[PDB]
Amino acid sequence: AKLIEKKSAYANTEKDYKMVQEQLSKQRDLYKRKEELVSTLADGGYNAQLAKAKTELNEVSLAIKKSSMKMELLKKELLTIEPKLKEATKDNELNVKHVKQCQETCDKLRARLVEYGFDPSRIKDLKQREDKLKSHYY
Amino acid sequence: LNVVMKNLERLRGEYNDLQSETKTKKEKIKGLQDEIMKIIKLQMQNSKVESVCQKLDILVAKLKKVKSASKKSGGDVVKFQKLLQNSERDVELSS
Amino acid sequence: TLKSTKHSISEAENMLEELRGQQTEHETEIKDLTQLLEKERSILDDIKLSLKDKTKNISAEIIRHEKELEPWDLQLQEKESQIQLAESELSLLEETQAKLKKNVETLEEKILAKKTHKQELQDLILDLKKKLNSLKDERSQGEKNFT
Amino acid sequence: NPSSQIIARNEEILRDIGECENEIKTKQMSLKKCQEEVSTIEKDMKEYDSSKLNELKKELKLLAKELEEQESESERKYDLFQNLELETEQLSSEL
Secondary structure (H helix, E strand, O other), X not given: OHHHHHHHHHHHHHHHHHHHHHHHHHHHHHHHHHHHHHOOOOOOOHXXXXXXXXXXXXXXXXXXXXXXXXXHHHHHHHHHHHHHHHHHXXXXXXXXXXXXXXXXXXXXXXXXXXXXXXXXXXXXXXXHHHHHHHHHHO | OHHHHHHHHHHHHHHHHHHHXXXXXXXXXXXXXXXXXXXXXXXXXXXXHHHHHHHHHHHHHXXXXXXXXXXXXXXXXXXXXXXXXXXXXXXXXXX | OHHHHHHHHHHHHHHHHHHHHHHHHHHHHHHHHHHHHXXXXXXXXXXXXXXXXXXXXXXXXXXXXXXHHXXXXXXXXXXXXXXXXXXXXXXXXXXXXXXXXXXHHHHHHHHHHHHHHHHHHHHHHHHXXXXXXXXXXXXXHHHHOOO | OOHXXXXXXXXXXXXHHHHHXXXXXXXXXXHHHXXXXXHHHHHHHHHXXXXXXXXXXXXXXXXXXXXXXXXXXXXXXXXXXXXXXXXXXXXXXXX
């Protein structure tokens, strides 16, 4: 019942987060309406709004320029590192081949080992069994 | 690094001519400041706004205290139900 | 059971008293906050009703200054923006440089640690050899006499 | 062999790059309002020139108040839900 109630409480918390987001949007709309009402204090205040809009447009243009410069730098870095990756792919393939040959050699030698008829865990278990047997014996 | 140093030197020069224009800009700004220095009620309005903000904070604290009191009442009701169950068990044990 | 019931009853009574006190304090605080908000609204209305400041000449001089600075507008501020538009990369290279420095600084320290590690490992190895001796010879003496 | 590790960075050299593109789009989104705001400023030149419309904005605030009315329950319900959650938690804790 508590797991069911915890699932219900998680659903209710998601609903409450959605309602809090809606309330934040409504509060932002109310603040915008209050600012528009207070802006009334015949175009004297339009100059400040035009200056603010021009500043916002300049900031957006600067952000776009910075993003384009970052994208160009990243593309140049990728084009410069592409030959480095093409050259390191050979070393990676060589390491993979060495790992594979080590795996196959270890597998063949383990087959030989199990063909020689010996197991460490089996011998240890048999020794412990003989130990407890002779223990109760004496 | 040297290219960027020459670039920032050119930026210092353009800031110098910007300050050359800012001479007259600040002259106009000082004219506007001397015109607007006539103004007061703004201090009383700011004090009233601060008092209203303090009252809103006190109201939020009172709402939080009311929520805590409701939670304490729920906990007390749960404790009273547990005590009633324990009293029934104790009556059965006494019988 | 009686001790538990008495403890629960005392806790319930204390919780009820605390809840009553908190409700009274919250009602008093709400009344005080409402009175303070009403007083602040009245003071704000009284200050706005008598807020004139003789803004005629102020607005005239502001309009004159704006019309004069129309050639000296924010077009200069953008000329300063390019400054930081360079300053960003003025750090960026160095940032990458610092990254390269980190690409070095991450190795030596830990490599140095590895050195110490293997060192003490060898030491421990030698130490084990010592106890190995004390495990062998005594063992050789542990049977015969015991036999 | 860490020479392939820088290759992974090359992958980032694309990934963040794409994000940068999105950032550019974000900037465009800002522009989609920024210049539009300028137009709105122009609308102000047509609005303030021809007064009581700000009072209508108060009605919009009333609409927001209506939303706040919903919030007056919603957040409250949320608080109740929180309390419920707390209760549930308490129950769980008890269990």
